[PDB]
Design a protein around this ligand. Structure first.
Ligand SMILES: Cc1sc(NC(=O)C2=C(C(=O)O)CCC2)c(-c2nc(C3CC3)no2)c1C
Length: 134
């Protein structure tokens, strides 16, 4: 038993609320928002030693990040921001902070029932994307 055992596995997107507005807050352009909005990505979470890997796969783009909890890393986002990212574990919840150009967004992943719930926040604006086991 470990840190992120309840996160590990293959997950598929089943619902999304307020995603377009979150993207607008983040600065995503029109064409990228429309493409992002169609996608039903799979999210593959694995653990090896202290290293967590999260891959996101979709028709558009496959991304992947590997990190250690608390250690800052360089990340290219799906919309092509170059950001400074730190992921930590806040008692059960994976808390992902992305910092760029004086701005900051926070993405929280938590297990609720059989769901992996992804909560995305920037300034006022919150989007909720719900995943289930593939
Ligand atoms: C095919 C996809 S999927 C996707 N995004 C996601 O799937 C996200 C999450 C998830 O559910 O994993 C949580 C954060 C965004 C984007 C995309 N996102 C963004 C900015 C908001 C970052 N721009 O493009 C695109 C082109």
């Amino acid at each position: 038993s470990h840190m992120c055992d309840a996160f590990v596995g293959t997950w598929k997107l089943v619902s999304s609320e307020n995603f377009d507005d979150y993207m607008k807050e983040v600065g995503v352009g029109f064409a990228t928002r429309k493409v992002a909005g169609m996608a039903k990505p799979n999210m593959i979470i694995s653990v090896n030693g202290d290293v967590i890997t999260i891959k996101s796969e979709s028709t558009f783009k496959n991304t992947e990040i590997s990190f250690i909890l608390g250690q800052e890393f360089d990340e290219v986002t799906a919309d092509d921001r170059k950001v400074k990212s730190t992921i930590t574990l806040d008692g059960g919840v994976l808390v992902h902070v992305q910092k760029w150009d004086g701005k900051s967004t926070t993405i929280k992943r938590k297990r609720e029932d059989d769901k992996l719930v992804v909560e995305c926040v920037m300034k006022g604006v919150t989007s909720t994307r719900v995943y289930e086991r593939a």
